[PDB]
Design a protein around this ligand. Structure first.
Ligand SMILES: [Mg+2]
Ligand SMILES: [Mg+2]
Ligand SMILES: [Mg+2]
Length: 430
DNA sequence: ATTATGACGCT
DNA sequence: AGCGTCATG
């Protein structure tokens, strides 16, 4: 009762750019705006692989991981933008730079954790305290929340989507106790006001729209963000969790979309995240381990403690290329030429990183895949990264992987390589 | 023949 | 250290 902590101590947002690479290309080329359009990598094989899709194109069933030729079957007027190619490979610099634009705006409002190229967690607890002290018991106007959904509302005693949104927001705001500076629901609401401001700033200053979730922890904020896309934000209160989770497939919660989630479903004979509440913490630990079990026990009650890490920059800088089927690398000359191309992109990005961010990577990780192995990586070997020099990096990479050549001949490479990956890691300030 | 990343856990 | 899992622009 009075001692059961409810995980309502923080205000956490998750901001996710809508169809991010598409928006980057639509900003650059206005002919693509407000059209079904997608971004593809490469072009020769089945038209290129789609990696981002505008919401107009999603209405036709176009999805990521679809070949552009197949997408064109669903969407004959689909417009396509291609990722830049440099040194024979896809080069994502434009999108990384656009991401930095967005991350720097977000960082004006609060500490952020860069969770991916297009999404960041925001710890708003402090900012909310500040804004609450400035409001001085002033109620919160619905006008301050023009794109906010309150998950679970309206309920009880309305034909159009915006009307529903406003009905729910009105129910929520009329129930609020703005006299209480420590009300978690009030804190979430002020958090949503700040996120409206953040999203307005991002769109004003970059052109890019985003969606966002506001809740008490990262998992709920991420879940919330997905509920109303695009260009909307969703507040998931602690009180909304039982109904929300009662029909939520386990695979929708971040980290449960893979093998672990499938085992939770199969071992416990459940489907929805709310069904987890009927197990003791010890039961969950016995099936899924101490860490997972404790996490599941709290998470199915809406409680999670994982902090928003203060980290706006990537921890690693990597370059990767697949060589599928017939294009696999079967000669030493091939392997060395591509190691060099990857190393040259890596050197460029590393030198820029050192200039922008006052750090140097100290470890080079070399990963390969060989023909036949169904794993992402067949082999991972690290070595010292002591100078930002592509020729040295490519030579060292060849050094750590050359023993994998089964071929008795010096010039041939067997089994041929279907993937090369160079990753710079272990940064130190400089 | 989706690809190209990136974070983090396990042992 | 090297491997595996999860996410998925
Ligand atoms: Mg996104
Ligand atoms: Mg994202
Ligand atoms: Mg996505």
């Amino acid at each position: 009762g009075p001692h059961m902590a409810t995980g309502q101590d923080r205000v956490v947002a998750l901001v996710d750019m809508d169809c991010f690479f598409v928006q980057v290309e639509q900003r650059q080329n206005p002919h693509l705006r407000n059209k079904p359009c997608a971004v593809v990598q490469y072009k020769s094989w089945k038209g290129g692989g789609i990696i981002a899709v505008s919401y107009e194109a999603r209405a036709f069933g176009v999805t990521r991981s679809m070949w552009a030729d197949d997408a064109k079957k669903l969407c004959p007027d689909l417009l396509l933008a291609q990722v830049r190619e440099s040194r024979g490979k896809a080069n994502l610099t434009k999108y990384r730079e656009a991401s930095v634009e967005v991350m720097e705006i977000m960082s004006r409002f609060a500490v952020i954790e860069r969770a991916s190229i297009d999404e960041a967690y925001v710890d708003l607890t402090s900012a909310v305290q500040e804004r609450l002290q400035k409001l001085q018991g002033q109620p919160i106007s619905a006008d301050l929340l023009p794109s906010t959904y309150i998950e679970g509302l309206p309920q009880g005693p309305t034909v159009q989507k915006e009307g529903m949104r406003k009905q729910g927001l009105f129910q929520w705001l009329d129930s609020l106790q703005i006299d209480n500076l420590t009300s978690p629901d009030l804190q979430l609401t002020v958090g949503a006001v700040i996120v409206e401001e953040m999203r307005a700033a991002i769109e004003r200053e970059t052109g890019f729209q985003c969606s966002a979730g506001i809740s008490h922890n990262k998992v709920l904020a991420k879940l919330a963000c997905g509920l109303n896309k695009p260009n909307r934000q969703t507040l998931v209160s602690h009180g909304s969790v039982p109904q929300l989770f009662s029909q939520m497939p386990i695979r929708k919660i971040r980290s449960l979309g893979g093998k672990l989630g499938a085992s939770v479903i199969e071992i416990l004979g459940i489907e929805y995240m709310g069904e987890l509440t009927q197990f003791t913490e010890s039961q969950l630990q016995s099936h899924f381990g101490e860490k997972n079990g404790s996490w599941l026990y709290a998470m199915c009650r809406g409680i999670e403690h994982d902090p928003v890490k203060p980290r706006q920059l990537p921890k690693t800088i990597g370059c990767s290329k697949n060589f599928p089927g017939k294009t696999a690398l079967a000669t030493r000359e091939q392997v060395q030429w591509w190691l060099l191309q990857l190393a040259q992109e890596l050197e460029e990005r590393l030198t820029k990183d050192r200039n922008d961010n006052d750090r140097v990577a100290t470890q080079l990780v070399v990963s390969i895949r060989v023909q036949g192995d169904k794993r992402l990586s067949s082999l991972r070997r690290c070595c010292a990264l002591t100078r930002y020099d592509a020729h040295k990096m490519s030579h060292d990479a060849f050094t750590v992987i050359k023993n994998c050549n089964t071929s008795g001949i010096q010039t041939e490479w067997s089994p041929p390589l279907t993937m090369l990956f160079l990753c710079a890691t272990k940064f130190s300030a400089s």
